[PDB]
Design a protein around this ligand. Structure first.
Ligand SMILES: [Cl-]
Ligand SMILES: [Mn+2]
Length: 339
């Protein structure tokens, strides 16, 4: 047997054993319906020390990059060194402190070449390797001619503060967006921030518990060996048009001026907060799947799926693109629309 459960009223397959070599056989049956999957325990496969903030900060801290304020998506005056200093030290953050993100750094070929050991560890550790590994039999990514695949097909590193210190749970560390290709998202480090009156690890666990959760998720949360990092909301790709209309309607309501051809999904300008998700369900019938991503959880999303993320703790995520047959058509079309 293949240990598994379902989360979110059958939308998401939870594969419970990263070591089970037949995971793909069950995944295949759920993927073909456009269901996401999450594989827990991948950090146990990884060289987890390579992915700690202290290690990534030391190895790559001298390179300059833009830091984003997640509240308004305005590039910050902070440098990479100031970003990493504030990763777990709230007092070293600039002011109410800001939620910073170091996005896609490094990414694509630079990831493979500048972090070769981490890239090697990633390849070794990718779950569902039949799909997710470049040499997997169902992965078309390295076989397709160039124009079928996005130009930025690569691994990505994403590091960001949690929103808890700012006490602003209207902030997304990743705004609502659509996935142009199949993708696996792995939480490889969770950092507990300290200072300036921030909620503690335990106060933050209670914050997670106050969310509307599936019973299966509440159980994981009681488990002291699991470290919850980030709150995810995931939407079925079939709901993309309704969500876009909902956001355009909210935009008009708040008097938020827009261009005529205004596409809030493409803009990636929204974090759909609790009150808004409730209105989205009531007014358009669109259901939210809620996931808490724990350290070592790999979330696997098909092309066309939408999601947003809200780090509670400081988090480092590594994502990897792949191209399954199942969603190639959708992926190609979304890829072309990206022009
Ligand atoms: Cl490396
Ligand atoms: Mn994404």
């Amino acid at each position: 047997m293949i240990p598994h459960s379902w989360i979110c009223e059958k939308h998401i397959l939870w594969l419970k054993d990263y070591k089970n070599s037949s995971n793909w056989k069950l995944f295949k049956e759920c993927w073909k319906q456009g269901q996401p999957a999450v594989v827990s325990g991948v950090h146990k496969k990884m060289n987890i020390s390579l992915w700690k903030a202290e290690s990534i900060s030391l190895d790559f801290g001298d390179h300059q990059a833009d830091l984003l304020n997640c509240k308004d998506s305005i590039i910050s005056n902070a440098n990479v060194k100031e970003f990493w200093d504030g990763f777990e030290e709230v007092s070293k953050r600039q002011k109410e402190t800001v939620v910073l993100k170091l996005k896609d750094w490094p990414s694509g070929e630079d990831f493979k070449t500048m972090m070769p050991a981490r890239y090697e560890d990633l390849l070794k550790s990718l779950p569902l390797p039949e799909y997710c590994n470049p040499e997997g039999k169902f992965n078309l990514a390295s076989h397709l001619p160039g124009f079928f695949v996005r130009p930025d097909l690569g691994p990505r590193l994403c590091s960001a503060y949690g929103v808890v210190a700012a006490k602003d749970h209207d902030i997304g560390t990743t705004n609502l967006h659509i996935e142009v290709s199949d993708v696996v998202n792995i939480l490889v480090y969770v950092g507990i921030a300290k200072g300036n009156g921030i909620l503690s690890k335990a106060g933050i666990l209670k914050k997670f518990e106050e969310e509307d959760l599936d019973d299966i998720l509440r159980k994981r949360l009681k488990d002291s060996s699991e470290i919850p990092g980030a709150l995810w909301h995931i939407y079925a790709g079939k709901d993309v048009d309704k969500i876009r209309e909902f956001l355009q309607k909210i935009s008009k309501e708040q008097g938020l001026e827009v261009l005529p051809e205004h596409d809030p999904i493409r803009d990636q300008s929204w974090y759909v907060n609790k009150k808004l998700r409730q209105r989205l369900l009531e007014e358009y019938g669109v259901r939210t799947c809620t996931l808490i991503q724990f350290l070592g959880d790999a979330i696997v999303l098909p092309a066309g799926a939408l999601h947003q993320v809200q780090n509670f703790h400081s988090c480092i995520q590594v994502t990897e693109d792949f191209v399954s047959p199942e969603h190639l058509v959708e992926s190609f079309h979304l890829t072309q629309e990206l022009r």
